[PDB]
Amino acid sequence: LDEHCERLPYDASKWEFPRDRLKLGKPLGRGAFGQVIEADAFGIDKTATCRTVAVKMLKEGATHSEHRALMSELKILIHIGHHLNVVNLLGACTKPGGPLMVIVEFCKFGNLSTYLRSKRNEFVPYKVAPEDLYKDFLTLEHLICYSFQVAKGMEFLASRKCIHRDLAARNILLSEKNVVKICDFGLARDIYKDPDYVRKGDARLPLKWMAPETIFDRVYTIQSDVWSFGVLLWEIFSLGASPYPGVKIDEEFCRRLKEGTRMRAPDYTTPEMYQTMLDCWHGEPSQRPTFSELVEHLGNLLQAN
Ligand SMILES: COc1ccc2c(Oc3cnc(CC(=O)Nc4cc(C)cc(CN(C)C)c4)c(OC)c3)ccnc2c1
Numbered sequence: 132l133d134e135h136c137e138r139l140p141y142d143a144s145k146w147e148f149p150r151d152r153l154k155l156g157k158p159l160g161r162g163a164f165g166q167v168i169e170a171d172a173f174g175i176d177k178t179a180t181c182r183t184v185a186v187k188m189l190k191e192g193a194t195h196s197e198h199r200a201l202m203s204e205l206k207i208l209i210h211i212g213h214h215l216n217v218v219n220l221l222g223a224c225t226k227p228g229g230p231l232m233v234i235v236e237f238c239k240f241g242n243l244s245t246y247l248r249s250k251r252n253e254f255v256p257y258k259v260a261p262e263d264l265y266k267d268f269l270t271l272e273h274l275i276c277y278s279f280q281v282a283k284g285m286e287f288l289a290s291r292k293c294i295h296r297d298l299a300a301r302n303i304l305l306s307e308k309n310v311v312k313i314c315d316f317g318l319a320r321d322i323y324k325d326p327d328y329v330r331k332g333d334a335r336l337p338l339k340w341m342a343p344e345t346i347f348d349r350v351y352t353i354q355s356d357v358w359s360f361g362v363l364l365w366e367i368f369s370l371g372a373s374p375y376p377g378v379k380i381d382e383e384f385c386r387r388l389k390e391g392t393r394m395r396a397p398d399y400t401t402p403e404m405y406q407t408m409l410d411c412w413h414g415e416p417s418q419r420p421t422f423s424e425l426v427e428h429l430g431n432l433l434q435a436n
Pocket of ligand 1 (some may be wrong): 159160167185186187204207208211217218233234235236237240241242294296313315316317
């Protein structure tokens with residue numbers, strides 16, 4: 132349903148937030164044409180309550196085309212609606228005289244790739260030592276829990292007839308109480324400057340996260356997002372490492388992948404989590420697990436761990 136966004140509704144009476152009730156702060160993420168800014172919103176979700184929020188908007192260099200793209204993103208966020216594991220839309224500023232602003236809840240710890248890399252040294256598979264009890268360490272349970280939550284969020288997106296197209300740990304945010312939310316920086320990331328995006332024709336694409344059918348056939352489905360989810364699992368259980376370490380991402384990488392070449396197990400995986408990565412990476416899209424099956428499986432692993 133996310134291919135024809137322009138026909139989706141924008142109910143101003145529900146979503147419109149006055150620009151003067153927003154106290155704009157520091158940048159959280161900046162692209163070439165878009166940006167994400169921290170802000171204090173007055174009474175956006177609870178009467179007369181200040182709330183820290185994240186605001187997506189355009190910047191110098193953007194054109195009317197990026198403005199139309201941002202409005203489509205607002206419409207799809209409305210269609211998607213709320214779930215614990217998706218960043219929740221809180222409001223928007225669309226009235227003339229100011230920039231189009233898309234306001235979502237704030238996720239204090241930022242993107243999951245940077246977070247896990249920063250916390251790599253503070254990881255223990257199992258907190259079992261009596262002295263280690265009051266140490267805020269990441270454990271296997273936390274990693275499986277983040278994995279399970281992203282699958283729940285993706286299952287939810289799928290139920291809304293939407294697909295992600297850029298699922299990766301950089302598009303996962305961490306909030307308080309170990310809650311992770313799916314986001315999509317999009318224009319608020321500078322893909323022409325970001326090494327995760329590689330020139331493949333006239334577009335800069337996240338090649339290391341793409342299914343062979345996306346690279347070779349330009350096919351995007353929920354099952355290609357499952358492939359991306361497998362790559363995300365590898366990022367989680369490598370504690371924020373970059374995929375395919377030491378591999379030049381060229382025509383040869385793409386052919387080897389298309390032929391069945393896969394990544395080796397990351398350093399912090401359990402045998403079952405690596406098997407789950409291999410299952411998401413099945414060459415045949417229909418043979419990959421679905422998000423509903425991944426939710427059930429990860430929920431089982433979380434209960435077994
Ligand atoms: C502390 O540092 C930080 C740093 C960054 C933060 C943050 O960044 C944002 C990231 N992305 C967006 C846009 C977005 O998520 N759009 C979107 C969401 C879904 C579920 C689906 C689709 C549709 N597509 C096709 C899949 C689009 C933001 O909008 C305001 C903010 C949010 C909160 N807190 C943040 C804290």
